[PDB]
Amino acid sequence: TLNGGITDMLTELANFEKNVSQAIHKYNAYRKAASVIAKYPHKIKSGAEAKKLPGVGTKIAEKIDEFLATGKLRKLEKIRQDDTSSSINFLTRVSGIGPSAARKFVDEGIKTLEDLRKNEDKLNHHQRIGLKYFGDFEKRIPREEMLQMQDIVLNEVKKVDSEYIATVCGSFRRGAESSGDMDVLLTHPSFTSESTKQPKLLHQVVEQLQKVHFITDTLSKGETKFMGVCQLPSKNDEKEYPHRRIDIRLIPKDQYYCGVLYFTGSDIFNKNMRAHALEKGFTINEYTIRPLGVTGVAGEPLPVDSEKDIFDYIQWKYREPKDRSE
DNA sequence: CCGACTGCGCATCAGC
DNA sequence: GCTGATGCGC
DNA sequence: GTCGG
Ligand SMILES: Nc1ncnc2c1ncn2[C@H]1C[C@H](O)[C@@H](COP(=O)(O)OP(=O)(O)CP(=O)(O)O)O1
Ligand SMILES: [Mg+2]
Ligand code: NA
Ligand code: NA
Ligand code: NA
Numbered sequence: 001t002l003n004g005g006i007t008d009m010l011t012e013l014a015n016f017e018k019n020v021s022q023a024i025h026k027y028n029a030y031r032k033a034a035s036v037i038a039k040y041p042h043k044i045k046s047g048a049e050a051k052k053l054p055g056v057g058t059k060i061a062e063k064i065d066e067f068l069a070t071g072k073l074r075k076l077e078k079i080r081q082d083d084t085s086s087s088i089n090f091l092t093r094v095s096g097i098g099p100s101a102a103r104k105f106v107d108e109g110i111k112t113l114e115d116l117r118k119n120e121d122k123l124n125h126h127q128r129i130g131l132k133y134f135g136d137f138e139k140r141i142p143r144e145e146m147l148q149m150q151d152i153v154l155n156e157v158k159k160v161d162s163e164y165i166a167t168v169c170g171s172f173r174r175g176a177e178s179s180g181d182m183d184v185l186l187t188h189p190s191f192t193s194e195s196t197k198q199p200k201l202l203h204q205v206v207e208q209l210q211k212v213h214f215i216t217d218t219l220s221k222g223e224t225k226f227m228g229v230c231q232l233p234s235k236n237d238e239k240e241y242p243h244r245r246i247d248i249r250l251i252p253k254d255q256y257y258c259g260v261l262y263f264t265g266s267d268i269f270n271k272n273m274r275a276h277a278l279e280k281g282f283t284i285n286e287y288t289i290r291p292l293g294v295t296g297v298a299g300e301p302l303p304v305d306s307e308k309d310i311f312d313y314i315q316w317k318y319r320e321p322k323d324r325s326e
Numbered sequence: 327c328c329g330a331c332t333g334c335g336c337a338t339c340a341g342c
Numbered sequence: 343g344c345t346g347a348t349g350c351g352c
Numbered sequence: 353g354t355c356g357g
Contacts, residue, residue: 060354
C-alpha cells in the first residue's frame with residue numbers, strides 16, 4: 001500500500017514514545033500523522049508535501065525527508081540497538097503488560113519470553129493469560145473465521161434469551177478481511193438508561209459461551225464489559241484454531257446507536273470524530289452525545305435515532321462503517 | 327506562544 | 343470496606 | 353509533536 005514505509009516509521013515512533021518514553025501525547029501525535037498519511041492518495045515525494053497534512057508538523061516533516069533520502073531513520077536505528085528500549089517494547093506485546101509493568105520487569109532483569117515463563121508468580125491474572133496465548137494473539141483472524149465466530153456467538157445468545165441482540169463490530173463491521181479480535185455489542189430490552197430490571201444480564205451470556213466451550217479464559221469482567229479468550233471448535237484430526245481475544249459490551253438498549261458507533265471505530269476515527277464534536281461544541285461517548293455549555297459542562301443527552309443522527313449533529317456527512325478505517 | 331489534545335470499564339494499589 | 347488515582351485495553 | 357486562536 002500507500003506510503004507504507006513512512007507510516008510504519010511513524011507507528012514505530014509512536015510505540016517508542018508510548019512504551020519507553022511514556023509520552024502519551026507524542027504517541028497520539030505520531031498515530032494521527034500515520035493515519036492521515038495512510039489515507040493520502042499520493043506517494044509522498046517529500047516532507048514539504050507531507051507537512052500540508054494536518055498532524056504533520058515540522059519534526060515529522062524532517063523525519064520523512066530523512067527516510068525518503070536514506071531508506072531509514074537513524075533515531076529508530078539507535079532505538080532498535082538499545083537493549084533496554086527493545087526489551088520494554090517487547091514486553092508490552094504481552095496483553096496486560098503496559099509501559100509501566102514492562103519497565104518494572106526489565107528493571108528486575110526480566111527481559112525475555114522465557115524470563116516471563118520462569119516468573120509467572122510475578123504476573124497478575126490478565127498478564128498470565130496474555131503470556132499463555134502470546135503466540136495466538138499475534139495472529140490475525142481471517143474474516144472467514146470471524147463469520148463462524150459470529151454464528152456461534154449469535155446463536156448461543158439467542159438460546160439464552162431471544163430478546164438479546166448481539167452485533168459484531170470493530171474491524172469486522174467495517175468490512176476488514178481480517179480482525180485482531182472479536183468485538184460484540186450486546187443489548188437486551190431489560191437494560192436501558194432508565195433501568196436495569198434484570199441482574200446478571202451479561203453474566204448469563206458469558207456463562208452460556210463458557211458452557212459450550214467457546215469462551216476459554218477470562219481477562220476481566222464486570223456488569224457491562226467482558227474481556228477474554230475464545231476458540232472455534234476444530235474437526236477430527238484437524239489442528240486447533242488459535243485462541244482469540246473477545247470483548248463483549250453490554251450497552252443500554254436506548255443507547256444502541258452511540259454504542260455501535262463507538263464499538264465500530266476505528267479508534268483513531270472515534271478520536272477524530274470526538275475531537276470534531278468538541279469543535280462543534282458537543283461531547284460524544286459510547287452512551288450519548290451531549291451539548292457543551294459556555295461554562296464547559298456537558299448538558300443533557302440529545303435524541304438519537306440513528307448513527308447518522310450523530311453525524312448530523314456535528315455537521316459531518318454520514319460515513320459508512322467501511323469508510324471509517326482511519 | 328501555549329493550553330489542549332476522545333472517552334471510559336475493570337483491575338489494582340494507596341491511604342484512611 | 344471505601345474513595346480516588348493509576349495502569350491497561352478497548 | 354501539532355496546532356488554533
Ligand atoms: N482509544 C480508543 N478511543 C476510542 N474508541 C476506541 C479506542 N480503542 C478502541 N475503540 C473502539 C473503536 C474500535 O473499533 C473498537 C474495538 O476495539 P479494537 O481495539 O478491537 O479495534 P478494531 O477497530 O477492532 C481493530 P482489530 O482488527 O485489530 O481488532 O473500540
Ligand atoms: Mg477489534
Ligand atoms: Na501539518
Ligand atoms: Na501489552
Ligand atoms: Na476487542
